[PDB]
């Protein structure tokens, strides 16, 4: 997710495109990446398969999958191209674009410090938890009978416009096997797929009705786009972009499918026999998915109240494959119209982010961080109109806009195992292929309107998802009065000062180095610490990608000139002392395969076995 996940896969790429070998900033030109067209070959597969049988040590098998997957990719292109005959177009001359590059970052040396006995590391971590979090360290006294306790008490829900069968509401637990954790953090296990959990998750009541597409709604949207184009964008690209539309093209589909992996291509291939046309695919029908992981934050709140259940609304598989070739062009056009001091995390890597903010943040500087998650976007219909107006200005072809618009109105969801039907009104968060883009556009628009001209005169601004940071801005009564037109809790704002109250961004800390004198971003150690106290399901063999992720994260923590700063940042955020010992404990855990085995224990089986 964004920077890096627990398995070190992340959402960002790993190729630098914003690096230069000169001590000054240089403007360059954006180019295109050529893609190899797949080709079909059956005679090679037949002979290789027979040659696979006679001798295959290690690389002989790999040639078979590469040949087999390559055949599947060619077949998908041939079938997919025929469906969208009424929307296919050709290549028109492109509009050139330019971008700015920055010099490479400088880092301080790192020294490794670790203990020897792995059991002592567990004792230190347990001592740290008890001293700082007394209630959390005394919760576990028996096994994990959460499923049984949830069945004993009844079902409480707050639904709206839903139907279900009462005869299928039964929640007797099934077999559950896991490994007993060693760290005394009480991280819950993922929930079981039952009808009771589905109703508990859908306990949200956002029933609000306003003017759908009337005159007052249009007036608010018209003002919003005016502020965005006046305080956050330059005027050198609008007229050129309107002349050249964006349409579905063979190159878009060929490039997209080639980027998929093995298993993903096979899954898509299985749904190409009865291929519906593009105009036949419904755009307002979704399916319900439950398989998720619970989210826990440092503190003592999960030992008193049960956490919520996460859900996913999945769209049609063919809908996200026909039109997913226009995401790259939309990103390029958006980056071209933004001001040089306004940045977006799309199409960057970890190193590029460090080089941009290398010489901007210094001690004693005020930074404003604001999130917009706590806001009901379903109350006002103008939030959807504003996004469409921005999309139309960017140069989206007219019939394609109708297909996109159909997914932002009335939608329905269904649960296949139980046949449960749900209906929702205007919704912004979903599982479609424009979710981050629309959220980023709305985040910039909200900030631009509230801050007015204070956004233009700034040193560095970064926007991604629902989080943002703006340099050199404080909190005054003018923004409170402007934002209090409807209510007061639209957004949450926090004031931060470098080297005194470290700013928080995307689950990390922004710190200023001492030896070199440059800014850098590091991860959150407490978030990792609670995560090692999560039970591991039996039969899982993913205990090697996590060790490498921990090893990389530990090295970044032990850089010289950042030990003292990290201590103060954690204390000013969570009011906790003594994290250097925890970091040392993490170092010895991620040193060998056998040292990582001390975080687990004997296997415990519940609700299973007729003995």
């Amino acid at each position: 997710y964004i920077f890096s996940s627990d398995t070190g896969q992340g959402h960002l790429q790993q190729k630098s495109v914003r690096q230069t070998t000169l001590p000054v900033n240089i403007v360059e030109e954006v180019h295109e990446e050529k893609c190899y067209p797949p080709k079909l070959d059956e005679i090679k597969e037949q002979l290789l398969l027979k040659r696979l049988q006679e001798s295959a040590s290690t690389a002989n098998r790999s040639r078979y999958q590469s040949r087999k997957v390559e055949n599947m990719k060619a077949m998908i292109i041939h079938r997919l191209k025929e469906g969208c005959r009424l929307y296919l177009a050709s290549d028109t001359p492109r509009v050139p674009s330019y971008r700015i590059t920055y010099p490479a970052p400088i880092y301080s040396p790192s020294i490794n410090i670790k203990l020897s006995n792995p059991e002592t590391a567990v004792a230190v971590c347990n001592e740290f938890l008890a001293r700082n979090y007394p209630t959390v360290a005394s919760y576990q006294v028996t096994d994990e009978y959460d499923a049984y306790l949830d069945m004993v008490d009844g079902s409480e829900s707050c639904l709206d416009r839903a139907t279900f069968n009462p005869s299928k509401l039964r929640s007797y637990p099934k077999q559950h096997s896991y490994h007993a954790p060693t760290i005394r953090s009480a991280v819950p296990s993922p929930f079981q797929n039952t009808l009771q959990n589905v109703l508990a998750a859908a306990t949200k009541r956002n029933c609000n009705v306003t003017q759908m597409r009337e005159l007052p709604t249009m007036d608010s949207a018209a003002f919003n786009v005016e502020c965005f184009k006046k305080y956050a964008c330059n005027q050198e690209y609008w007229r050129e972009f309107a002349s050249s539309p964006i349409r579905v093209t063979t190159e878009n589909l060929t490039t997209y499918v080639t980027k998929l992996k093995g298993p993903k291509a096979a899954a898509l291939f299985a749904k190409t026999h009865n291929l519906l046309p593009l105009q036949e695919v419904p755009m307002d029908r979704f399916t319900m998915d439950m398989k998720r992981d619970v989210k826990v934050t440092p503190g003592t709140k999960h030992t008193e109240e049960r956490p919520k259940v996460q859900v996913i609304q999945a769209a049609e598989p063919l809908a996200t494959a026909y039109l997913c070739g226009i995401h790259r062009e939309l990103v390029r056009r958006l980056n071209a119209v933004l001001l040089p001091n306004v940045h977006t995390l799309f199409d960057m890597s970890a190193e590029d982010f460090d080089a941009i903010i290398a010489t901007h943040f210094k001690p004693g500087d005020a930074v404003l961080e604001t999130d917009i998650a706590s806001f009901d976007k379903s109350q006002d219909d103008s939030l959807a109109l504003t996004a469409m107006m921005l999309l139309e200005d960017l140069g989206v072809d007219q019939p394609i806009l109708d297909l996109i618009e159909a997914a932002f109105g009335e939608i329905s969801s269904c649960h296949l195992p139980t046949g449960t039907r749900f209906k929702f009104g205007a919704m912004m968060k979903s599982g479609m292929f424009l979710t981050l883009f629309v959220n980023t556009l709305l985040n910039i628009t909200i900030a631009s309107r509230v801050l007015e001209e204070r956004l233009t005169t700034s040193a560095c601004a970064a926007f991604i998802g629902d989080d943002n940071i703006i340099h050199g801005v404080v909190s005054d009564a003018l923004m409170a009065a402007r934002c209090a037109t409807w209510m007061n809790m639209e957004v949450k704002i926090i004031d931060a000062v470098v080297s005194v109250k470290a700013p928080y961004f995307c689950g990390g800390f922004i710190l200023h180095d001492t030896v070199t004198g440059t800014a850098c971003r590091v991860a959150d150690p407490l978030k990792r610490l609670f995560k090692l106290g999560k039970p591991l399901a039996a039969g899982d063999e993913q205990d090697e990608d996590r060790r490498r992720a921990l090893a990389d994260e530990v090295t970044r923590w032990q850089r010289t000139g950042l030990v003292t700063e990290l201590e103060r940042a954690v204390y000013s955020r969570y009011e906790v002392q003594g994290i250097t010992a925890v970091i040392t404990s993490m170092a010895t855990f991620a040193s060998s395969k056998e040292n990582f085995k001390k975080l687990r224990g004997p296997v415990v089986t519940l609700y299973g076995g007729p003995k």
Partner: protein
């Protein structure tokens, strides 16, 4: 409004209101009795009857306690033989209350009730318009309405005939349902009223509602000379309502399962009918009418309507260390039966059925308003009930895998047929049951000899209590 002695949080209030839609019921608890549900139903039944009886009409009351009829503004004639072990307590209480409030109100013919009670104490064989010491056969008072309240010790055709020749044209009966005893079962229960009954031969069981056993280790055998090798129902049956014990007989219990129409032939002929007007989870109210003369024809059938499930299966248990098998019957709420329709389409093990029933026994609340209760049925009957459903589903799959021909019953020179196993009987809600009974009666035998049953010391005590009139 009518007040009942139950708490406000009980789930039985909804059932009572549904069965009595012409009243307004409120709870008011003043006593923690263990049989509150049973007593509440009887209180409401009497109120309904009094609204259907024309006033200024005298009423007979067979086997009554006169303490609870004192405040009623009607004409009651109690028939109180001195036959049971509770009679002396009832008589003393009746006298004490009469004298203690002889002048406070004096508006319910208190003086008359005292006057004729003294007359009976002088001469035993005396008839008074309020009290007597005879039986239902030896009584001589003439009336037109008879009321039976929890009577199980008389023969219905004989008792009814003696009332008819004295001018009675209407009768009422209140008591438990007699359907389980027509199926020849060994044990049963009424969960809603906390009532358990069992045969005298299985009082040493282990997993029924009325039993007691001991701990043993296992010895090779017993030198019991008397060998029966038979286990069949007998006459003796024991009842337990709350914490009270009542012995009963099967012959008298089955005699109250009357058909729709029957004839009584003797020195005079009568025609009678029988209908059910109130039914709630085990308690029924029956109305019987009589008319002189013979009309129509009889068939001899009894019909019972089921508003909820009824089960009768076969179970295995150890009686006094020996493993045997018998039959058990019970009642099931309608909501539970409805939601098991989809599960029983295939074969299911008893282990799985028990787990499903427990899950279905939990509350469902949507938007702050409840839809399913937290305890629809009691938990001590789930194991036996879950076993019954397992066998029922098995017997349905075998029936549909062996098809016969239309209009032909196969019986295969000598021709013979085969009988199949039947280990469970299930009567779903909204389903009727029909039985065969007798509809013609012509024999009415009586002892024809009455003897007094009152002792001298009891007479002196009653007179002494009534002596102090202030």
């Amino acid at each position: 409004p009518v007040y009942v002695d139950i708490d406000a949080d009980s789930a039985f209030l909804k059932a009572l209101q549904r069965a009595y839609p012409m009243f307004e019921v409120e709870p008011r608890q003043v006593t923690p009795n263990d049989a509150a549900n049973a007593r509440a139903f009887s209180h409401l039944a009497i109120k309904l009857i009094e609204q259907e009886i024309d006033p200024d009409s005298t009423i007979l009351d067979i086997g009554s306690a006169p303490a609870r009829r004192m405040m009623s503004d009607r004409k009651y004639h109690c028939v109180c033989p001195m036959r049971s072990a509770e009679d002396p307590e009832r008589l003393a209480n009746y006298a004490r209350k009469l004298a203690s409030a002889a002048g406070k109100v004096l508006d319910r013919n208190i003086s008359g009730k005292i006057g004729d009670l003294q007359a009976v104490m002088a001469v035993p064989d005396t008839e008074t318009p309020t009290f007597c010491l005879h039986t239902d056969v030896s009584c001589r008072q003439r009336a037109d309405v008879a009321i039976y309240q929890d009577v199980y010790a008389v023969h219905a055709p004989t008792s009814l005939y003696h009332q008819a020749i004295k001018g009675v044209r209407l009768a009422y009966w209140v008591g438990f349902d007699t359907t389980p005893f027509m199926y020849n079962a060994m044990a049963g229960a009424y969960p809603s009223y906390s009532t358990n009954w069992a045969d005298e031969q299985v009082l040493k069981a282990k997993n029924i509602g009325l039993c007691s056993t001991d701990l043993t280790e296992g010895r090779r055998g017993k030198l019991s000379i008397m060998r029966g090798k038979k286990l069949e129902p007998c006459d003796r049956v024991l009842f337990s309502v709350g914490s009270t014990l009542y012995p009963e007989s099967r012959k008298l219990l089955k005699s109250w399962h009357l058909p729709s129409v029957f004839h009584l032939k003797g020195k005079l002929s009568f025609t009678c009918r029988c209908d059910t007007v109130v039914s709630c989870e085990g308690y029924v109210v029956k109305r019987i009418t009589m008319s002189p003369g013979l009309y129509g024809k009889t068939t001899g059938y009894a019909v019972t309507h089921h508003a909820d499930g009824f089960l009768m299966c076969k179970t295995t248990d150890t009686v006094d260390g020996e493993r045997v098998s018998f039959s058990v019957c019970t009642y099931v709420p309608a909501t539970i039966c409805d939601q098991m329709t989809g599960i029983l389409a295939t074969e299911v093990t008893p282990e799985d059925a028990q787990k499903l029933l427990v899950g279905l026994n939990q509350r469902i609340v949507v938007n702050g308003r409840t839809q399913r209760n937290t305890n629809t049925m009691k938990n001590y009957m789930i194991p036996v009930v879950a076993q019954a459903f397992s066998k029922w589903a098995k017997e349905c799959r075998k029936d549909m895998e062996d098809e016969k021909l239309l209009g032909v019953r196969e019986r295969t020179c000598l021709w013979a047929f085969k009988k199949q196993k039947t280990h469970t009987v299930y009567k779903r809600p909204d389903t009727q049951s029909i039985q065969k009974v007798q509809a013609e009666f012509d024999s009415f035998v009586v002892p024809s000899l009455w003897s007094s049953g009152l002792s001298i010391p009891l007479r002196t005590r009653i007179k002494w209590l009534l002596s102090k009139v202030p």
